Short mmCIF file of all heavy atoms in Angstrom, two decimals:
data_model
loop_
_atom_site.label_atom_id
_atom_site.label_comp_id
_atom_site.label_asym_id
_atom_site.label_seq_id
_atom_site.Cartn_x
_atom_site.Cartn_y
_atom_site.Cartn_z
N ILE A 289 16.86 1.37 14.06
CA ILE A 289 15.84 1.02 13.08
C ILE A 289 14.61 1.88 13.34
O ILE A 289 14.09 1.91 14.46
CB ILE A 289 15.50 -0.47 13.13
CG1 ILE A 289 16.66 -1.29 12.55
CG2 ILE A 289 14.22 -0.76 12.36
CD1 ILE A 289 16.53 -2.78 12.74
N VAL A 290 14.15 2.58 12.30
CA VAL A 290 13.02 3.49 12.40
C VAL A 290 11.84 2.88 11.66
O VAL A 290 11.97 2.44 10.51
CB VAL A 290 13.37 4.88 11.82
CG1 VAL A 290 12.25 5.86 12.10
CG2 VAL A 290 14.68 5.37 12.40
N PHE A 291 10.69 2.84 12.33
CA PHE A 291 9.48 2.21 11.81
C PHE A 291 8.48 3.28 11.41
O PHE A 291 7.92 3.97 12.27
CB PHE A 291 8.88 1.26 12.85
CG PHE A 291 7.83 0.34 12.31
CD1 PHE A 291 7.67 0.17 10.94
CD2 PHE A 291 7.00 -0.36 13.16
CE1 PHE A 291 6.70 -0.68 10.45
CE2 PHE A 291 6.03 -1.21 12.67
CZ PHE A 291 5.88 -1.37 11.31
N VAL A 292 8.25 3.42 10.11
CA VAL A 292 7.17 4.23 9.58
C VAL A 292 6.07 3.27 9.13
O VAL A 292 6.27 2.44 8.23
CB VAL A 292 7.64 5.15 8.43
CG1 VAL A 292 8.55 6.23 8.98
CG2 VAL A 292 8.39 4.36 7.37
N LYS A 293 4.91 3.34 9.78
CA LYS A 293 3.85 2.38 9.54
C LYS A 293 2.50 3.07 9.40
O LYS A 293 2.25 4.10 10.04
CB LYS A 293 3.78 1.34 10.67
CG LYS A 293 3.26 1.87 12.00
CD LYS A 293 3.09 0.74 13.00
CE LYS A 293 2.33 1.20 14.23
NZ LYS A 293 2.16 0.11 15.23
N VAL A 294 1.65 2.51 8.55
CA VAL A 294 0.26 2.93 8.48
C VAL A 294 -0.51 2.29 9.63
O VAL A 294 -0.23 1.15 10.03
CB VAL A 294 -0.34 2.55 7.12
CG1 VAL A 294 -1.70 3.20 6.93
CG2 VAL A 294 0.60 2.94 5.99
N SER A 295 -1.47 3.03 10.18
CA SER A 295 -2.22 2.53 11.33
C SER A 295 -2.99 1.27 10.98
O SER A 295 -3.02 0.31 11.77
CB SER A 295 -3.17 3.62 11.84
OG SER A 295 -2.48 4.84 12.03
N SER A 296 -3.63 1.23 9.82
CA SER A 296 -4.42 0.09 9.39
C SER A 296 -4.16 -0.19 7.92
O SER A 296 -3.89 0.74 7.15
CB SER A 296 -5.92 0.33 9.62
OG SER A 296 -6.40 1.37 8.79
N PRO A 297 -4.24 -1.46 7.50
CA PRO A 297 -4.07 -1.77 6.07
C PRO A 297 -5.16 -1.19 5.19
O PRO A 297 -4.94 -1.04 3.98
CB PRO A 297 -4.09 -3.30 6.04
CG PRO A 297 -4.84 -3.70 7.26
CD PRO A 297 -4.51 -2.66 8.30
N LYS A 298 -6.33 -0.86 5.75
CA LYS A 298 -7.39 -0.25 4.95
C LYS A 298 -6.94 1.10 4.40
O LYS A 298 -7.24 1.45 3.26
CB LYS A 298 -8.65 -0.09 5.80
CG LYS A 298 -9.40 -1.40 6.04
CD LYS A 298 -10.18 -1.83 4.82
CE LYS A 298 -11.07 -0.72 4.29
NZ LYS A 298 -11.90 -0.09 5.36
N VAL A 299 -6.22 1.88 5.21
CA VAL A 299 -5.67 3.14 4.74
C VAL A 299 -4.57 2.88 3.71
O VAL A 299 -4.46 3.60 2.71
CB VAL A 299 -5.15 3.97 5.92
CG1 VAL A 299 -4.50 5.26 5.43
CG2 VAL A 299 -6.27 4.26 6.90
N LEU A 300 -3.73 1.87 3.96
CA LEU A 300 -2.59 1.61 3.09
C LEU A 300 -3.02 1.20 1.69
O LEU A 300 -2.40 1.60 0.70
CB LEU A 300 -1.70 0.53 3.71
CG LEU A 300 -0.49 0.11 2.87
CD1 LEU A 300 0.45 1.29 2.65
CD2 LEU A 300 0.25 -1.04 3.53
N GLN A 301 -4.07 0.39 1.58
CA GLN A 301 -4.54 -0.04 0.26
C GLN A 301 -4.98 1.16 -0.58
O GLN A 301 -4.61 1.27 -1.75
CB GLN A 301 -5.68 -1.04 0.41
CG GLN A 301 -6.50 -1.24 -0.86
CD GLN A 301 -7.63 -2.23 -0.67
OE1 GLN A 301 -8.40 -2.14 0.28
NE2 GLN A 301 -7.72 -3.19 -1.58
N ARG A 302 -5.75 2.07 0.02
CA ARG A 302 -6.21 3.24 -0.72
C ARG A 302 -5.07 4.22 -0.97
O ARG A 302 -5.09 4.94 -1.98
CB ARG A 302 -7.36 3.91 0.03
CG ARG A 302 -8.11 4.95 -0.78
CD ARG A 302 -9.25 5.54 0.02
NE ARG A 302 -10.26 4.54 0.34
CZ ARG A 302 -11.27 4.74 1.18
NH1 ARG A 302 -11.43 5.90 1.80
NH2 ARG A 302 -12.14 3.75 1.40
N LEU A 303 -4.08 4.26 -0.08
CA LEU A 303 -2.90 5.08 -0.32
C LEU A 303 -2.12 4.57 -1.53
O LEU A 303 -1.63 5.36 -2.34
CB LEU A 303 -2.01 5.10 0.92
CG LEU A 303 -0.76 5.98 0.88
CD1 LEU A 303 -1.14 7.43 0.65
CD2 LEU A 303 0.03 5.83 2.17
N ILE A 304 -1.98 3.25 -1.65
CA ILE A 304 -1.36 2.67 -2.83
C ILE A 304 -2.20 2.95 -4.07
O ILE A 304 -1.67 3.20 -5.16
CB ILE A 304 -1.13 1.16 -2.63
CG1 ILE A 304 -0.13 0.92 -1.49
CG2 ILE A 304 -0.63 0.51 -3.91
CD1 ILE A 304 -0.12 -0.50 -0.98
N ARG A 305 -3.53 2.91 -3.92
CA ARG A 305 -4.41 3.24 -5.03
C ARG A 305 -4.23 4.68 -5.51
O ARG A 305 -4.52 4.97 -6.68
CB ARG A 305 -5.87 3.02 -4.63
CG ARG A 305 -6.35 1.59 -4.78
CD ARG A 305 -7.54 1.32 -3.87
NE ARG A 305 -8.59 2.32 -4.04
CZ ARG A 305 -9.41 2.39 -5.08
NH1 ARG A 305 -9.33 1.53 -6.08
NH2 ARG A 305 -10.32 3.36 -5.13
N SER A 306 -3.75 5.57 -4.65
CA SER A 306 -3.62 6.98 -5.00
C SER A 306 -2.49 7.25 -5.99
O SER A 306 -2.39 8.37 -6.50
CB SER A 306 -3.40 7.82 -3.74
OG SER A 306 -2.17 7.50 -3.12
N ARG A 307 -1.63 6.26 -6.26
CA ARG A 307 -0.50 6.47 -7.15
C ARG A 307 -0.88 6.37 -8.62
O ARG A 307 -0.51 7.24 -9.42
CB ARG A 307 0.61 5.46 -6.83
CG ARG A 307 1.13 5.54 -5.41
CD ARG A 307 1.45 6.97 -5.01
NE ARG A 307 2.36 7.60 -5.96
CZ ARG A 307 2.37 8.89 -6.25
NH1 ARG A 307 1.52 9.73 -5.68
NH2 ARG A 307 3.25 9.36 -7.13
N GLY A 308 -1.61 5.34 -9.00
CA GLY A 308 -2.03 5.17 -10.38
C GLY A 308 -2.11 3.70 -10.73
O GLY A 308 -1.95 2.83 -9.88
N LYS A 309 -2.37 3.44 -12.01
CA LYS A 309 -2.53 2.07 -12.49
C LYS A 309 -1.24 1.27 -12.42
O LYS A 309 -1.29 0.04 -12.42
CB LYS A 309 -3.08 2.08 -13.92
CG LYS A 309 -3.59 0.74 -14.43
CD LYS A 309 -4.43 0.00 -13.39
CE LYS A 309 -5.75 0.70 -13.13
NZ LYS A 309 -6.47 0.11 -11.96
N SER A 310 -0.09 1.94 -12.36
CA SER A 310 1.18 1.22 -12.32
C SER A 310 1.31 0.38 -11.06
O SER A 310 1.79 -0.76 -11.11
CB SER A 310 2.34 2.22 -12.42
OG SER A 310 2.25 3.21 -11.41
N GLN A 311 0.89 0.91 -9.91
CA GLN A 311 1.05 0.21 -8.64
C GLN A 311 -0.03 -0.84 -8.39
O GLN A 311 0.13 -1.65 -7.47
CB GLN A 311 1.07 1.21 -7.49
CG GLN A 311 2.10 2.31 -7.65
CD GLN A 311 3.50 1.77 -7.89
OE1 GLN A 311 4.14 2.11 -8.88
NE2 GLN A 311 3.97 0.92 -6.98
N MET A 312 -1.11 -0.84 -9.18
CA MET A 312 -2.13 -1.88 -9.01
C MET A 312 -1.60 -3.25 -9.38
O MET A 312 -2.06 -4.26 -8.84
CB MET A 312 -3.36 -1.54 -9.85
CG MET A 312 -3.75 -0.06 -9.89
SD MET A 312 -3.76 0.86 -8.34
CE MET A 312 -4.54 -0.30 -7.21
N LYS A 313 -0.63 -3.32 -10.30
CA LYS A 313 -0.04 -4.60 -10.66
C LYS A 313 0.68 -5.23 -9.48
O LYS A 313 0.60 -6.45 -9.27
CB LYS A 313 0.92 -4.42 -11.84
CG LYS A 313 0.24 -4.03 -13.14
CD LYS A 313 1.20 -4.11 -14.32
CE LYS A 313 2.18 -2.95 -14.30
NZ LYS A 313 3.03 -2.92 -15.53
N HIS A 314 1.39 -4.42 -8.70
CA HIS A 314 2.18 -4.91 -7.57
C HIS A 314 1.48 -4.71 -6.23
O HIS A 314 2.13 -4.83 -5.19
CB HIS A 314 3.55 -4.22 -7.55
CG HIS A 314 4.40 -4.53 -8.74
ND1 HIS A 314 5.28 -5.59 -8.76
CD2 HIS A 314 4.50 -3.93 -9.95
CE1 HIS A 314 5.90 -5.62 -9.93
NE2 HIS A 314 5.44 -4.63 -10.67
N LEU A 315 0.18 -4.41 -6.24
CA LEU A 315 -0.54 -4.20 -4.98
C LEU A 315 -0.55 -5.47 -4.13
O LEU A 315 -0.46 -5.39 -2.90
CB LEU A 315 -1.97 -3.73 -5.27
CG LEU A 315 -2.87 -3.43 -4.07
CD1 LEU A 315 -3.77 -2.25 -4.35
CD2 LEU A 315 -3.72 -4.65 -3.72
N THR A 316 -0.70 -6.63 -4.76
CA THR A 316 -0.78 -7.88 -4.02
C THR A 316 0.46 -8.09 -3.15
O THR A 316 0.37 -8.12 -1.92
CB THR A 316 -0.96 -9.06 -4.98
OG1 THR A 316 -1.93 -8.71 -5.98
CG2 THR A 316 -1.43 -10.29 -4.23
N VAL A 317 1.63 -8.20 -3.78
CA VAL A 317 2.87 -8.43 -3.03
C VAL A 317 3.17 -7.28 -2.08
O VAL A 317 3.88 -7.46 -1.09
CB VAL A 317 4.04 -8.68 -4.01
CG1 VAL A 317 3.78 -9.92 -4.84
CG2 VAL A 317 4.25 -7.47 -4.90
N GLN A 318 2.63 -6.09 -2.36
CA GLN A 318 2.88 -4.93 -1.52
C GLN A 318 2.14 -4.99 -0.19
O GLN A 318 2.41 -4.15 0.68
CB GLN A 318 2.49 -3.66 -2.27
CG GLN A 318 3.37 -2.46 -1.99
CD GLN A 318 3.14 -1.32 -2.96
OE1 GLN A 318 2.31 -1.41 -3.87
NE2 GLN A 318 3.88 -0.23 -2.78
N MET A 319 1.23 -5.94 0.00
CA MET A 319 0.44 -6.03 1.22
C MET A 319 0.97 -7.04 2.23
O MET A 319 0.99 -6.75 3.42
CB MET A 319 -1.02 -6.35 0.89
CG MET A 319 -2.02 -5.57 1.73
SD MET A 319 -2.18 -3.84 1.23
CE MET A 319 -3.21 -4.00 -0.22
N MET A 320 1.38 -8.24 1.79
CA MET A 320 1.97 -9.17 2.74
C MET A 320 3.27 -8.65 3.34
O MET A 320 3.57 -8.95 4.49
CB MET A 320 2.21 -10.54 2.10
CG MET A 320 0.96 -11.22 1.55
SD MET A 320 0.19 -10.38 0.17
CE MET A 320 1.09 -11.11 -1.20
N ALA A 321 4.04 -7.86 2.58
CA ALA A 321 5.20 -7.20 3.16
C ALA A 321 4.82 -6.21 4.25
O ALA A 321 5.68 -5.85 5.06
CB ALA A 321 5.99 -6.48 2.07
#
């Protein structure tokens, strides 16, 4: 099992923001995972 992880969720939220308005709908569920 290989773990690719962001160091902090602060980076991950803005990384998800970098995709577009499509991923803002699923941003919530994308964080508890």
Side-chain angles (χ1 to χ4, degrees):
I289 288 171
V290 188
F291 193 14
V292 291
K293 71 174 191 180
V294 191
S295 310
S296 66
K298 286 283 309 310
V299 177
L300 177 61
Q301 163 181 50
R302 192 178 296 170
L303 184 60
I304 295 164
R305 276 157 51 74
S306 65
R307 301 311 306 149
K309 193 43 68 189
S310 55
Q311 306 306 124
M312 321 315 317
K313 293 190 286 187
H314 296 269
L315 181 144
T316 316
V317 298
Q318 215 168 0
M319 221 75 78
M320 301 66 88

